[PDB]
Amino acid sequence: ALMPDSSGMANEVVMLRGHNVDYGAPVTSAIRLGGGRIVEVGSSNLATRWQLESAINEKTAALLYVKSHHCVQKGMLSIDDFVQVAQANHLP
Amino acid sequence: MTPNIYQQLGLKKVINACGKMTILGVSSVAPEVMQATARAASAFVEIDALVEKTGELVSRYTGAEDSYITSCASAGIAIAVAAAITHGDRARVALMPDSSGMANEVVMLRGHNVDYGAPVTSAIRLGGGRIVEVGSSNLATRWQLESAINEKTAALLYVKSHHCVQKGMLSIDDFVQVAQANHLPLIVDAAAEEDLRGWVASGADMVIYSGAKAFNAPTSGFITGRKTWIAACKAQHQGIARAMKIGKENMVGLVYALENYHQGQTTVTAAQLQPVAEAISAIHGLYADIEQDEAGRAIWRIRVRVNASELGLNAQDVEAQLRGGEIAIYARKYQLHQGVFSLDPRTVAEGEMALIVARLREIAEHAAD
Amino acid sequence: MTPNIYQQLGLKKVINACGKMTILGVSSVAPEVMQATARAASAFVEIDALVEKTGELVSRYTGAEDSYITSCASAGIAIAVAAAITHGDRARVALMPDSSGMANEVVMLRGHNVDYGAPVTSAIRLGGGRIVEVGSSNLATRWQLESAINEKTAALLYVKSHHCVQKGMLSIDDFVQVAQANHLPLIVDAAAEEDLRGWVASGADMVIYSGAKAFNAPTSGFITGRKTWIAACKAQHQGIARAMKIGKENMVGLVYALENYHQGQTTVTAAQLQPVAEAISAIHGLYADIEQDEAGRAIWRIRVRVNASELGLNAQDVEAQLRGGEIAIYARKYQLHQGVFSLDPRTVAEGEMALIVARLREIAEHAAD
Amino acid sequence: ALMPDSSGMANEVVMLRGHNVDYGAPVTSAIRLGGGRIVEVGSSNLATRWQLESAINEKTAALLYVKSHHCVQKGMLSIDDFVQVAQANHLP
Ligand SMILES: [Cl-]
Ligand SMILES: [Mg+2]
Ligand SMILES: [Mg+2]
Ligand SMILES: [Mg+2]
What we know:
Chains A, D: This is Selenocysteine synthase (L-seryl-tRNA(Ser) selenium transferase). Chain A is of the alpha/beta class. Helices cover 25% and strands 15% of the residues of chain A. The first copy, chain A, is built from three helices and three strands. The first copy, chain A, has a three-stranded parallel β-sheet with strand order 2-1-3, covered by helices on one side. The radius of gyration of chain A is 13 Å and the shape is globular.
């Protein structure tokens, strides 16, 4: 009943900066409607796994992986990197 | 050959057939450029007078009103951002990079937030800037760039690099129109660009180049642009620019490197590389031919393809034995999965081309080993 | 005479008889050192291997576990402070100098907060540090140093320079005991110090020297000390150290300058300066004699007394003509109000002494005409 | 009557860092007893006139010049620099 006012909760959505794409509307809009706050990982051309691990903290709510031709392909982390990092920290 | 100075220090002789790579020292300086660098290091000079003269001489090649030589392009980004936030004010220069109460936002495209070995935000943050990204990674509109401007905005940044996403981004003209409409300085990051005049001609207030990268200079860089903003760049010498120091030897070296780049540019034609490609193709299991850039750029390289069945080793192991040998020979390994390695002759010195084919002949003999 | 590289650029010829002044280019590099620098710039090298080797070679002079070459001492201060805050962690390296939320306090004596052309706090602030001053400008106590240590403290800084106040300050031993008792790294700023082993052996974790100011090297510096903290210094290459870049040519130039410093350590004697003082005294109204420094070091200068009534110009007018002439001759102007200017021969090249006595004779003729 | 509490008043006392001396008790303790807030100008070896002028603002109450052998002598601003800055900003 409080959404999208996620104040005082773990509300950070960790995703790759190269996956913050626009499909006619920015993907951050749908994430913000769900009460999430964007935490972008890595640069637009390079993204290392330790950057994904470093974004996980006490306020992280979930990890987001975007599969689309809009996203940048090279230099990004695979889906398995997100599976392992999310499983290691027990995050959806 | 006679062992170079790195062999006398106990290190491997490096033959760079890959490009202007930072892991190999970026570039190789011309001997006559180092002669001017050596003479500058062996004599004293009024630094303030040298800063004015070198800025004038660099500006002769760019077309800007004034210039300021830095230690590198990353230093040029920090100084240019600091110049936009401090406006040259000595008290504000002393507080850098702490811009807690000032307009310190640097507006840039999200698709330009790239990593050139170090994130570009690190250089901006050293200049007291705060990142304000515009648009998505695949698309950016003009109203998004206009909307990011506010009272806390200090400058606009445009990054020119292959690291940036190319499609769906805004042009340099959009940044010029938004910057001048809000009376804000536009900073352009053209570190690896060999075009000295194109970006000052775009209307940008400050353009940053890397002397080592683009012009085979000793470790140096320079900010070029409008005189009022370059003056604000020089004011950082009593602040953050003291830690990003460049001495009298490399300031002079950059000037003579620009002169040498202006009076040369004779490249390796496809007819010069054919005798080398036939020498590599004479080896069993190797087939070499001349190739141009994908974008039609006047750059010709040696495309060497490896046959794993005939040679006995795949292209990955040939590239590993080239780098891992007693002479470290680095080649382009983008298409290494295709069984192909290319040799860029722009960074290859005279006689080193014969050393590459000699090592390739030795790798073929020891493939049965 | 043959014009130097700066006269060909339209600048004055500088005869430095004043000392290692930053406004004159700090220092003059030996020719055999620039020969090493020139070869290093004309060849490529595995940078990862060069950083390890140069750190190993520098560690032999300082006796430390490891060393790391920087662009300057100001860069070394920022890198050492960033190393103490980030501990080498790649996530914290990219956040610098934004150390918000981390232990970022750099504890130091208020009497060590000096300005060497740029305030030392600027270099510390570039590393993400926040200043915590201890004691007064005339007195500092040990309990003041221990009280300043808290959970947000990251490092302790000791500065050795003539700019610092000398009386009433704490000793280096007090900083070593407090730093190790709280398990904190101790940073020592010995930029212009020629003692390469004394500060590392005192227990300091990171000691910072200026290669240019102390050893007549090309623009370079180096941090030396514990292997773990030097490793945290190298970790900044993906962060703030990218904007403080030093290239392979000046890395090698620093190593050969440390070799050229230990060998052929030469000091001009008083007997060598007496023929020059006799020539200056042959001028009407000028008397020149050799004077040793007040401390008693092996440093002798040519003290020149000016008689305004007999020459027609006071010492201040002569010093202005020495800098204002066609050849910019810089001399020590501290005793200028007493009718005295001194000539320091340590930065005077061969044949430049005869040019000084020739200019002085020309000044005397233009005072009697 | 509110002294030494000067919370809502112009209470900053501008002085040189080289003059912040200890004569058995720190001079800041006496300044603080009168409700003063210490504002240090310049480094311990050099103090330029623009540094003194930049420390002056609406919350500045007075300028302090300490004459003592305990103070740093070289690189400091003279008494004439303090008088002129005080007259230009209408401060005691
Ligand atoms: Cl300060
Ligand atoms: Mg980033
Ligand atoms: Mg301006
Ligand atoms: Mg005589």
